[PDB]
Short mmCIF file of C-alpha atoms and ligand atoms in Angstrom, two decimals:
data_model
loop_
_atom_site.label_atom_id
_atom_site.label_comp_id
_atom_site.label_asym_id
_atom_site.label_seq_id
_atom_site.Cartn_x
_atom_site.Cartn_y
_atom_site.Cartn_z
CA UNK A 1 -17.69 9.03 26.45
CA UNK A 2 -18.55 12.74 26.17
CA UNK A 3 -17.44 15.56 24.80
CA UNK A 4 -16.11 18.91 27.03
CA UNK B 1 10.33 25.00 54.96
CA UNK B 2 8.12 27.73 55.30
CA UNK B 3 8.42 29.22 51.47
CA UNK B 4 6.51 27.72 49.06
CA UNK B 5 7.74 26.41 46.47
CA UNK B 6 6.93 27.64 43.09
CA UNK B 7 7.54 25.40 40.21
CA UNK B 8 8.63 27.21 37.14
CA UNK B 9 10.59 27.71 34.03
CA UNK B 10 10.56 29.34 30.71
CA UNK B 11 10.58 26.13 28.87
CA UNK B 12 8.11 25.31 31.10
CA UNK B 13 6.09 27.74 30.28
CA UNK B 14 6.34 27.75 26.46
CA UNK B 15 5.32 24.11 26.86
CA UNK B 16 2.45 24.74 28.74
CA UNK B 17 1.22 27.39 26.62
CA UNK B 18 1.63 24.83 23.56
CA UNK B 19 -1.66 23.52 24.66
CA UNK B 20 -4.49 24.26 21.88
CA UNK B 21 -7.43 24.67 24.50
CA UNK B 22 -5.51 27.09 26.40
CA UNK B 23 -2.94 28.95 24.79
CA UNK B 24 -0.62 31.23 26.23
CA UNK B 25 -2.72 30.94 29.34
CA UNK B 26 0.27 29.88 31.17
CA UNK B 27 2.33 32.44 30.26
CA UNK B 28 -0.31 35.16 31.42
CA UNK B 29 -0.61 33.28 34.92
CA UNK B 30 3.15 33.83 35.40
CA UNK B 31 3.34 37.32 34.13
CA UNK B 32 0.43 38.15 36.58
CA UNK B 33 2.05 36.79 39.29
CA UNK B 34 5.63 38.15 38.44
CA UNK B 35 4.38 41.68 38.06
CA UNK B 36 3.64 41.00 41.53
CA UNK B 37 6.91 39.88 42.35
CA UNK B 38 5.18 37.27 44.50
CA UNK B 39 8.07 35.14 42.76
CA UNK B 40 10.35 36.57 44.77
CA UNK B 41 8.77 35.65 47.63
CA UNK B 42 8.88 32.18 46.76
CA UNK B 43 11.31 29.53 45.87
CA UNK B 44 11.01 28.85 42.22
CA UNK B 45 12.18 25.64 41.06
CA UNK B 46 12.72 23.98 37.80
CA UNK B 47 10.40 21.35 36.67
CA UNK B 48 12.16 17.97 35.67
CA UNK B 49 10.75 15.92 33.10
CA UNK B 50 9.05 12.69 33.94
CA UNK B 51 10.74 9.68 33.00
CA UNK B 52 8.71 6.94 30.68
CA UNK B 53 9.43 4.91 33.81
CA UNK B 54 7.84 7.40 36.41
CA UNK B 55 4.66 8.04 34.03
CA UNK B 56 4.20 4.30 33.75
CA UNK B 57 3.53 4.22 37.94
CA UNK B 58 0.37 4.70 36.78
CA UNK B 59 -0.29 4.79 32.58
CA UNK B 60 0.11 1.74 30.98
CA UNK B 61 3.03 1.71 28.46
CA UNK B 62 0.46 0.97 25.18
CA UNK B 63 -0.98 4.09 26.00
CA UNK B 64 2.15 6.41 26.39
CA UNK B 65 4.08 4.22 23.29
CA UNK B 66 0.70 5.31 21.42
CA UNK B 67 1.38 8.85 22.76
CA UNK B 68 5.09 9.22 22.00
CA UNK B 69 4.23 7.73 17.91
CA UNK B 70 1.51 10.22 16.87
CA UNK B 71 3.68 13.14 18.69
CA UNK B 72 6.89 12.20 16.76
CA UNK B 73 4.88 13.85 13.75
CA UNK B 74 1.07 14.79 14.65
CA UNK B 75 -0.33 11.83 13.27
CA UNK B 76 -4.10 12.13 13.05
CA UNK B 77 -4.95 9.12 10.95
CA UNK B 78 -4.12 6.30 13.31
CA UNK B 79 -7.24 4.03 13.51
CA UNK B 80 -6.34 3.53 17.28
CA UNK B 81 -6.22 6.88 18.09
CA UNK B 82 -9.78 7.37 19.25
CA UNK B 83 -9.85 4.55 21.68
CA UNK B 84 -6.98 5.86 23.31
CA UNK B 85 -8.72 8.97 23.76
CA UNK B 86 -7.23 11.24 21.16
CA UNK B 87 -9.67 13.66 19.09
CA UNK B 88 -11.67 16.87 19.59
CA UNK B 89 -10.60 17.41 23.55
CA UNK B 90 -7.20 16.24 23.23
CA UNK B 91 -5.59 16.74 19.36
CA UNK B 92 -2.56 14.65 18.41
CA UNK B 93 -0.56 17.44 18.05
CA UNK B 94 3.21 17.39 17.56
CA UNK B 95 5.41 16.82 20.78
CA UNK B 96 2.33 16.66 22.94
CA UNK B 97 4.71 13.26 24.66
CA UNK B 98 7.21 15.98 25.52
CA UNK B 99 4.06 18.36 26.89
CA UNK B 100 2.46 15.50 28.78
CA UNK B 101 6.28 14.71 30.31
CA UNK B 102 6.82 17.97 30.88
CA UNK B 103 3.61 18.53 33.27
CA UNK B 104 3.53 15.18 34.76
CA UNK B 105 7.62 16.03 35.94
CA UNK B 106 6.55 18.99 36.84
CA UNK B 107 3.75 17.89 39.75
CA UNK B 108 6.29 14.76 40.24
CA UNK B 109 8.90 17.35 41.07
CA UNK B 110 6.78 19.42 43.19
CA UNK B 111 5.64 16.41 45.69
CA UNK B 112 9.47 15.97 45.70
CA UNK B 113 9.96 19.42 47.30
CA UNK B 114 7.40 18.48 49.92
CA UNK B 115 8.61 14.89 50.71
CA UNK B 116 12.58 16.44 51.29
CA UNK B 117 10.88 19.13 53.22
CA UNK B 118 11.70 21.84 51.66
CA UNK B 119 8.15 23.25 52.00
CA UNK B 120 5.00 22.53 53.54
CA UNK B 121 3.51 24.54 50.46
CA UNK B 122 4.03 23.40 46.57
CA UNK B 123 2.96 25.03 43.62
CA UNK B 124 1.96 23.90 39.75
CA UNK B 125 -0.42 26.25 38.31
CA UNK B 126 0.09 24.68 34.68
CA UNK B 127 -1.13 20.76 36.37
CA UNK B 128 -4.19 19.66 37.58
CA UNK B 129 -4.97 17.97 34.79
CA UNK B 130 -7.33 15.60 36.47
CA UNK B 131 -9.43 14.09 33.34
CA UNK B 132 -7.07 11.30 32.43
CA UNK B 133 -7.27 7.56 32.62
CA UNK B 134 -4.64 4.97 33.03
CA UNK B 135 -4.87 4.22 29.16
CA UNK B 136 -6.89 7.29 27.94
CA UNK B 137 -6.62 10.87 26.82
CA UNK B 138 -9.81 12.76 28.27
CA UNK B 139 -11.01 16.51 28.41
CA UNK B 140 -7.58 18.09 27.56
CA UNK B 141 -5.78 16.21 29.74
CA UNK B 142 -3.21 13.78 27.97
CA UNK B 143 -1.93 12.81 31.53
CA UNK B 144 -2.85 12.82 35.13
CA UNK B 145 -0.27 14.55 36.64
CA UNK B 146 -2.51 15.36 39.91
CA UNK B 147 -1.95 11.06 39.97
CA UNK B 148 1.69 11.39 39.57
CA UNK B 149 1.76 13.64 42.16
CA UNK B 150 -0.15 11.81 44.94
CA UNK B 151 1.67 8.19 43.93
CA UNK B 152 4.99 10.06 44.51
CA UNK B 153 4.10 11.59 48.15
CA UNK B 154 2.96 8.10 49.06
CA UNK B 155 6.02 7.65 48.96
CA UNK B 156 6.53 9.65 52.15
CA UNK B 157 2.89 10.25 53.80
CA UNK B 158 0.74 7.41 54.68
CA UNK B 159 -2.76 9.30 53.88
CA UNK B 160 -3.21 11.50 51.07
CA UNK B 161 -6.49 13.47 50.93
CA UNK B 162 -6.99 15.04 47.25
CA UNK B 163 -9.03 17.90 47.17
CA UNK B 164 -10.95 18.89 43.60
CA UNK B 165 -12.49 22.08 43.38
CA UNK B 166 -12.56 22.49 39.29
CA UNK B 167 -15.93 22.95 37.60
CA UNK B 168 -15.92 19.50 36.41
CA UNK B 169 -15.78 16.03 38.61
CA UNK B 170 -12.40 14.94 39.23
CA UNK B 171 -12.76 11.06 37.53
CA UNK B 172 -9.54 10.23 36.72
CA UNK B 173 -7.84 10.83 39.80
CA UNK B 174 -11.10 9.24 41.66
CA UNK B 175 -10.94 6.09 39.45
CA UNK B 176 -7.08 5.69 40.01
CA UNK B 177 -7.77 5.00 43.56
CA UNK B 178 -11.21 3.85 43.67
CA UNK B 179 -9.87 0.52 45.07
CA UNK B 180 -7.76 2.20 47.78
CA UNK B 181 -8.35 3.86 51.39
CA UNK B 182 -5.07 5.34 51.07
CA UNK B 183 -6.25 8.42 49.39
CA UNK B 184 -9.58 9.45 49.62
CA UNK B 185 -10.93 11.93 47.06
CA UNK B 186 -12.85 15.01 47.55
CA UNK B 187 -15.03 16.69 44.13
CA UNK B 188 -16.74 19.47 44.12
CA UNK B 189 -18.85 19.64 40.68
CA UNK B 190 -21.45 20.35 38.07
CA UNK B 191 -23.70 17.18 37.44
CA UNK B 192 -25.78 17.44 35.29
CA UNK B 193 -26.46 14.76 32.45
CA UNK B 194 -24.70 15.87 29.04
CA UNK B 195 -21.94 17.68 31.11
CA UNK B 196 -18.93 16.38 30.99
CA UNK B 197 -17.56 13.88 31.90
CA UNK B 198 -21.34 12.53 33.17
CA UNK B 199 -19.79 10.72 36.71
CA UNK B 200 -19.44 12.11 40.48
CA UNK B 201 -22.87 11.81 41.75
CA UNK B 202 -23.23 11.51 45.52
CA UNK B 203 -23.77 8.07 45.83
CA UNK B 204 -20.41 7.05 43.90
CA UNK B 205 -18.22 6.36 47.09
CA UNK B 206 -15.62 3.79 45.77
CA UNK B 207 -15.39 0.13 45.34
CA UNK B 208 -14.97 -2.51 47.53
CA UNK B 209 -12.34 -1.68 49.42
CA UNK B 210 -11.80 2.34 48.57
CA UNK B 211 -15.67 2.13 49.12
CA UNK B 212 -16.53 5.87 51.03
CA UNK B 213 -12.98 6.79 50.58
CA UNK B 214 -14.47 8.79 47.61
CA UNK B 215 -16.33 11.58 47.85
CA UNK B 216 -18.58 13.75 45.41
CA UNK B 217 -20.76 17.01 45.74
CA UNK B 218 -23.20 17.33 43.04
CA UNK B 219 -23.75 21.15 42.66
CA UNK B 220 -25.85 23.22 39.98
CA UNK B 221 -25.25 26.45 37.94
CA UNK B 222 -25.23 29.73 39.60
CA UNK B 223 -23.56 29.21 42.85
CA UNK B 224 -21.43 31.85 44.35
CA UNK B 225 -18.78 32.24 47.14
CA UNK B 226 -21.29 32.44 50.19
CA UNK B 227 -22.60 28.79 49.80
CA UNK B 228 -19.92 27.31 48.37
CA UNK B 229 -17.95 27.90 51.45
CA UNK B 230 -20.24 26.60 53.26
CA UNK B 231 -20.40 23.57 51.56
CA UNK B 232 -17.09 22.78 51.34
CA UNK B 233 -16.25 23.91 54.86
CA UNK B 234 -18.65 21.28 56.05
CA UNK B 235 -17.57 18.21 53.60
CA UNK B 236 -13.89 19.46 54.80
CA UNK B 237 -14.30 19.19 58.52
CA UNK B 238 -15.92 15.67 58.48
CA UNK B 239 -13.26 14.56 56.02
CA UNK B 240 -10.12 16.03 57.95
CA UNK B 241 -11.69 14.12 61.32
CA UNK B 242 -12.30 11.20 59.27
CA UNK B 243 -9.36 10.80 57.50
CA UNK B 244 -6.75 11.95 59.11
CA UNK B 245 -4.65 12.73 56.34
CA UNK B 246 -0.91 13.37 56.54
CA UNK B 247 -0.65 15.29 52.86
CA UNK B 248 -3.06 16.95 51.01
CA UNK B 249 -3.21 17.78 47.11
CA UNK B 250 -5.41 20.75 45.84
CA UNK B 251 -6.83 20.79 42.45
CA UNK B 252 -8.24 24.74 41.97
CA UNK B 253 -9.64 24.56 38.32
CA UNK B 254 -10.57 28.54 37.39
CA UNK B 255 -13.40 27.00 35.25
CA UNK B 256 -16.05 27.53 38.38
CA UNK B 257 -14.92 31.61 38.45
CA UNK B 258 -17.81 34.28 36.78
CA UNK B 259 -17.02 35.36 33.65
CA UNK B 260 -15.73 31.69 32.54
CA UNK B 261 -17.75 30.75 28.73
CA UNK B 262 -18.63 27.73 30.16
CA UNK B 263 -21.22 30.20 32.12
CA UNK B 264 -22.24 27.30 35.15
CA UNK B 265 -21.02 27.95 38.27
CA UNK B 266 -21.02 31.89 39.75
CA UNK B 267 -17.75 32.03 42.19
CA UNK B 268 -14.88 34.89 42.36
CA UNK B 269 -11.58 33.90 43.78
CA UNK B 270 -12.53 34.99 47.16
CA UNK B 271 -14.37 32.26 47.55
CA UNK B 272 -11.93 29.76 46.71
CA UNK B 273 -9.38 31.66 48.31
CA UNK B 274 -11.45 30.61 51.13
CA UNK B 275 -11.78 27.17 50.96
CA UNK B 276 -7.70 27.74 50.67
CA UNK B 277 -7.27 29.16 53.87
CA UNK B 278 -9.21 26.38 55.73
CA UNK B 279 -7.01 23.81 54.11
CA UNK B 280 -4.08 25.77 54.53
CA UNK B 281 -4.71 25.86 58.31
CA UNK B 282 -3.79 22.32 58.68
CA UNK B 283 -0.14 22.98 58.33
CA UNK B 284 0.24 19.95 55.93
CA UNK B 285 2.37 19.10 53.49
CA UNK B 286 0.17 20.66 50.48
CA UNK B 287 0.40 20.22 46.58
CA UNK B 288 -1.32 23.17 44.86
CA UNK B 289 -2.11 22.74 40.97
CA UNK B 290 -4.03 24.34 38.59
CA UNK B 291 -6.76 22.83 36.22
CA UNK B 292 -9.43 24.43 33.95
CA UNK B 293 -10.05 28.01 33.27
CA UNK B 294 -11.15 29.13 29.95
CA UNK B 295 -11.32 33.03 30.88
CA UNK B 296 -7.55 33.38 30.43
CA UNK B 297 -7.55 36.92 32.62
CA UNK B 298 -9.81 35.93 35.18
CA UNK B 299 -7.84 32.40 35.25
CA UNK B 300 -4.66 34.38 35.84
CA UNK B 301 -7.11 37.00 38.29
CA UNK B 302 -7.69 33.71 40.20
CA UNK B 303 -4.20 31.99 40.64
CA UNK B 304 -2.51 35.22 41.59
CA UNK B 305 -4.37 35.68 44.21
CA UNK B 306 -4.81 32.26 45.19
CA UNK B 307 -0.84 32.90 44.98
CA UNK B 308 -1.22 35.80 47.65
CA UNK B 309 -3.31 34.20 49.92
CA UNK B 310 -0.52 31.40 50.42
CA UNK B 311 1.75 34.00 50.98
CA UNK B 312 -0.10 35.61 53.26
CA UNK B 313 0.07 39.22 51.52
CA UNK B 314 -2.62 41.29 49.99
CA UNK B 315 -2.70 42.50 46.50
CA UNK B 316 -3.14 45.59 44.94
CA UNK B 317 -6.61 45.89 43.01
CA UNK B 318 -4.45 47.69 40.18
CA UNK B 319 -3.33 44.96 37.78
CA UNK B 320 0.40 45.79 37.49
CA UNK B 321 0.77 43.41 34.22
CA UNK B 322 2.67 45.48 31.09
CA UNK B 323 2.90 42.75 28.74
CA UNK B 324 -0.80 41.51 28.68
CA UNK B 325 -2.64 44.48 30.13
CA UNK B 326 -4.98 45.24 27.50
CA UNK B 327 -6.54 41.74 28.18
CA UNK B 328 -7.84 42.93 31.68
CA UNK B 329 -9.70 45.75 30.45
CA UNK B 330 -11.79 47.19 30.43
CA UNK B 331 -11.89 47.88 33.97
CA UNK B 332 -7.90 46.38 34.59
CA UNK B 333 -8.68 45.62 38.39
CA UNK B 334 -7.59 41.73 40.24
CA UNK B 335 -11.15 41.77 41.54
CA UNK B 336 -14.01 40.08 40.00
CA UNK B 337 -17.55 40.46 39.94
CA UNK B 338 -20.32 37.87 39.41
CA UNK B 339 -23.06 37.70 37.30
CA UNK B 340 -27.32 38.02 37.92
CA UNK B 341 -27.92 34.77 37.08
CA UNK B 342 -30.07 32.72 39.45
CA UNK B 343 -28.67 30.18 41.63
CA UNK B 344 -30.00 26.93 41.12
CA UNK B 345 -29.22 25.40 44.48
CA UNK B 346 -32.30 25.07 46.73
CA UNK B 347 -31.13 25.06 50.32
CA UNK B 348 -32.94 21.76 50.96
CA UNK B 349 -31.01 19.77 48.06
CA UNK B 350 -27.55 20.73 49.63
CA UNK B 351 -28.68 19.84 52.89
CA UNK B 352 -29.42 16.22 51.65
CA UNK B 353 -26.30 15.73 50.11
CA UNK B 354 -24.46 16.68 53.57
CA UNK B 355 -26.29 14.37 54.54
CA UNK B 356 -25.48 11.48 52.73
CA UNK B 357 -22.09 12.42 52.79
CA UNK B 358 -21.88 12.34 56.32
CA UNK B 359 -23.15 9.05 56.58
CA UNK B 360 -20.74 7.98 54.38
CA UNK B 361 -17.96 9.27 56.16
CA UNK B 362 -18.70 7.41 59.17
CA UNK B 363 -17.56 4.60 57.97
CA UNK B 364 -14.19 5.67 57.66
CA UNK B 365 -12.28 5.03 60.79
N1 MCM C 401 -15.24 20.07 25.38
C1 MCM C 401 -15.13 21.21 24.65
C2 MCM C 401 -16.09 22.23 24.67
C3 MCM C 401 -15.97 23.39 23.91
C4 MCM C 401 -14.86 23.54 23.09
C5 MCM C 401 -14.65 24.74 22.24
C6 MCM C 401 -15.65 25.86 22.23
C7 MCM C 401 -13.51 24.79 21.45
C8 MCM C 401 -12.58 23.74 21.46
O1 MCM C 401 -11.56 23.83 20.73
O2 MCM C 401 -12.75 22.62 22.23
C9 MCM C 401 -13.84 22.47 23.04
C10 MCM C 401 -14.01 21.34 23.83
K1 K C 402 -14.17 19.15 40.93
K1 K C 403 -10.28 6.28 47.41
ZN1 ZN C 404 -12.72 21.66 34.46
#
């Protein structure tokens, strides 16, 4: 999971 | 059936505009485009909202039942929150259910419009919200209305080819049907490890069965109308011969366009204005929709023109806005200008990936  | 359709309302709007990453941006892309009066040239019609039975064509019901409890009050403190996406990107604010309804109905309605036929052309500037999973809240999308959208003109066109032009790779749509050669998926992107969301490299083609019915163009920072074209004119033509499709849906995320703080890609809405036309000369049943676009102005430069270019009419360079025309200063003009910043994309790179691509796309037949 990453962040935008 | 030869006006587009332009999907709007003032509770519409003030719904959009609820959204904390963007605020009010939706309200500036209307007032753009109605100082224009390039509303009148269109056929505006209200969004409906989507049903809990129409969002669950693709969303499980855990996931919206999750969404509809922490709206009810803004609820931050539910353990199971996180896992269902909910945070930093996408807050559990209050009445985001009704927000998320509003937007998926909204995209649902406009693939309506184009199955009854009363348009070859419809328009969502506040959709395109292409992040989302099946079960998941991701980069500021709460749902995938670009999904919605596609399952609903199934209902009417055999082939749907989806079309992603937003800064960042279109996963949730791509992942929806990844296991399908029913719609084949088309993202043009930033990869680049850190960069959200991390997927859509050129070798992810689909699975199994939706295996090269999905394709991805890896791209780098500082890329500008000129190459892009040419890019996308070439991934375009092979697809279109390949495919065959009998509907297309466009996702035209502002977030590439110069001036954006994201700061990756170089474009001006020329460019994709571009890419517009050569879909637009297919004379298909077309879904346009919005996305990202965190320079509010230049977001609202972009889709009014965009707007134009459907139409078929050129705009005045004199931004005719009242209510927010101090936000286009200092120079107030539609155009845009991109930065010096280098372009990243060695020729040689690009011509691999067209490449590989085109191999890929032999396969579909
Ligand atoms: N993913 C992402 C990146 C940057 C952000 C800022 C600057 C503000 C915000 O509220 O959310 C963001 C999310
Ligand atoms: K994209
Ligand atoms: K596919
Ligand atoms: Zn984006």
């Amino acid at each position: 999971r990453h962040k935008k | 059936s030869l006006v587009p359709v332009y999907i709007y309302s003032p509770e519409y709007v003030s719904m959009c505009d609820s959204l904390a990453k963007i605020p009010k941006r939706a309200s500036m892309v209307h007032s753009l485009i109605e100082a224009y009066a390039l509303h009148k040239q269109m056929r505006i019609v209200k969004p409906k909202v989507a049903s809990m039975e129409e969002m669950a064509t693709f969303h499980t019901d855990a996931y919206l039942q999750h969404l509809q409890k922490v709206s009810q009050e803004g609820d931050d403190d539910h353990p199971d929150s996180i896992e269902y996406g909910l945070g930093y990107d996408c807050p559990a604010t209050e009445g985001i259910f009704d927000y998320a309804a509003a937007i998926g109905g909204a995209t649902i309605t406009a693939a309506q419009c184009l199955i009854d036929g009363m348009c070859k052309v419809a328009i969502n500037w506040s959709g395109g919200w292409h992040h989302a999973k099946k079960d998941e809240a991701s980069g500021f999308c709460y749902l995938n209305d670009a999904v919605l959208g596609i399952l609903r003109l199934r209902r009417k066109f055999e082939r749907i080819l989806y079309v992603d032009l937003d800064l960042h790779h279109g996963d949730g749509v791509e992942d929806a049907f990844s296991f399908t050669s029913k719609v084949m998926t088309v993202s043009l992107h930033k990869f680049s490890p850190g960069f959200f969301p991390g997927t859509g490299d050129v070798s992810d083609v689909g699975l199994g069965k939706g295996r090269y019915y999905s394709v991805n163009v890896p791209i780098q920072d500082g890329i500008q109308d000129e190459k892009y074209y040419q890019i996308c004119e070439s991934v375009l033509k092979e697809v279109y011969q390949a495919f065959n499709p009998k509907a297309v849906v466009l996702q035209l995320g502002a977030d590439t366009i110069a001036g954006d703080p994201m700061c990756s890609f170089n474009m001006t809405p020329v460019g994709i204005g571009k890419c517009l036309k050569y879909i637009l000369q297919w004379q298909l049943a077309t879904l346009i929709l919005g996305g990202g676009g965190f320079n509010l102005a230049n977001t609202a430069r972009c889709w009014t023109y965009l707007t134009g270019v459907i139409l078929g009419k050129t705009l005045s360079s004199e931004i005719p806005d009242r209510e927010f025309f101090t936000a286009y200063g200092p120079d107030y003009v539609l155009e845009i200008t991109p930065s010096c910043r280098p372009d990243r994309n060695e020729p040689h790179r690009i011509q691999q990936i067209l490449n590989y691509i085109k191999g890929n796309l032999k396969h579909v037949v």
